[PDB]
Design a protein around this ligand. Structure first.
Ligand code: WHL
Ligand code: NH2
Lengths: 121, 12
């Protein structure tokens, strides 16, 4: 079966830094945009909605608009990579990647936000 | 999952 996997299911990310959490999905032949759908959510907030290459800034929850994007270059490698800039304490919690690509699956990723004392923040 | 449930509908 089509399986989505996570290299890390727990991330510790610095307050004020950028973070990229990743979900892997199998891509054998050249990636087909017409078959690919990727959703990222956390606690009922819509973060990424990528439909056959289509996206719409408006559906993105306001707390993530202008901070969150899907790294397009990574998709052809079978990597659904969510990048969030300027990590806030409110970003800690559980994220869901849901991928449809000749089959469908999803994984949960847990993000912890820390503030190292000698870090930039 | 409700999110998972809604996602399968919109896709399938
Ligand atoms: C718990 C829950 O929300 N189930 C749910 C939500 C939405 C949908 N959407 C469609 O069926 C098209 C199904 C189940
Ligand atoms: N479908």
């Amino acid at each position: 079966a089509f399986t989505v996997t996570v290299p890390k299911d727990l991330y510790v990310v610095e307050y004020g830094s950028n973070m990229t959490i990743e979900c892997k999905f199998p891509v054998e032949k050249q990636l087909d945009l017409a078959a690919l759908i990727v959703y990222w959510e956390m606690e009922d907030k819509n973060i990424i909605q990528f439909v056959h290459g289509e996206e719409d800034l408006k559906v993105q929850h306001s707390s993530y608009r202008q901070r969150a994007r899907l790294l397009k270059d990574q998709l052809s490698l079978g990597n659904a990579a969510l990048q969030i800039t300027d990590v806030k304490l409110q970003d800690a919690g559980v994220y869901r990647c849901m991928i449809s690509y000749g089959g469908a699956d999803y994984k949960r990723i847990t993000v912890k936000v820390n503030a190292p004392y000698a870090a930039a923040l | 999952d409700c999110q998972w449930a809604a996602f399968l509908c919109r896709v399938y």
